[PDB]
């Protein structure tokens, strides 16, 4: 019992469609990040109310499709269906833009926190479409693979993009020994990865 | 009209217990089962359990079977009711957000729900945090690292500086505690003339630092 895919793309005007495999009395749910589920369509196919005309479901035999017809800005969210205690993954929906390359910055770490015994050295990727994207850490073109983290924003109510920031953390010890450091990122939009290096 | 008010975040240690509630107001509140959700950051709903209005009666997944108790209290005119969910012997896993939700026909559609209340588990203590600068169209930010708990807010220049600006979500690290970042982007020429301080608050533990970069 499961639902596809686990991203979609539309642009707005557009129809989209998202599929559950699930039996029985079926209900669909639109979950806005950090915000409750809404009810849009319960057992099946009867649309809730107060929830716009332009959702709809269908019990195509097995399985259940949820439509929405001329997507708007506000169904950017994501969709699950739920089936008793039984919850589907669910379904990030975001807006189609151009695909843009991604604006990527270095940060060195501070001396004035180097005085505290933690290094950190930040990557920054900026403004950026699709959501997708990987970042690696090279340094001495030593590959690091443990000691790091990234952060994700929400795509942008404004332009539509992404930004990323991925932070690695050292001691102060390790940070001294190597000197040249560098962050490499590919993306969707870049024929080829690029690095920023310090 | 038919609400349901949850109560704020809550920190806890491991090993301890964390109560929950929920207020439910303005309908029928005798004729609909509440239930129980939870969600962890980047993760699913799971059913935590239901309870009925009228007997008192829970039941819960396996998975929280003994450690957690779902209670409830009526008022006298049955116009609200308190509903709690009680977990003790936290454990890491048990960090998320708990949504209580009403039931409205027999077969588990949920039309209402409260908004959530967050459960940090977490070893560690109150602490503001240290903000370092990002330093450098160019980039620059502040490093906004190890506070507790969340959350914090980030301005510039007391809120006159807004259009630019990317505060990230907050991760937590191996030690316990909260990093994020918040950067913004400037024209390369603007930085002679103009001044850029990140503002930040974090009021539990009332730290609130401004930082030239
Ligand atoms: C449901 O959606 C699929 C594609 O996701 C489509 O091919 C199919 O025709 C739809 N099923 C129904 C019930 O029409």
Redesign the pocket.
Known sequence: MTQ?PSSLSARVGDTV???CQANGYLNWYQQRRGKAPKLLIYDGSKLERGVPARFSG????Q?Y?LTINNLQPEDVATYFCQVYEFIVPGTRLDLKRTVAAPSVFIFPPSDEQLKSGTASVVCLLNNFYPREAKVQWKVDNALQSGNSQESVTEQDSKDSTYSLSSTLTLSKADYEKHKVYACEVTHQGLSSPVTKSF | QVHLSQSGAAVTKPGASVRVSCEASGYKISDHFIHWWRQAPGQGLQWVGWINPKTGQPNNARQFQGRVSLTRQASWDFDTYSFYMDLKAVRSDDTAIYFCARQRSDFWDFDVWGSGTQVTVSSASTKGPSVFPLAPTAALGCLVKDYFPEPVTVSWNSGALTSGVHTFPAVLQSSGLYSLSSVVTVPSSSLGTQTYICNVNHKPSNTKVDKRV
Do not use: F, M, Y
């Open positions: 596809s469609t998202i599929t269908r019990r195509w035999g399985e499709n």
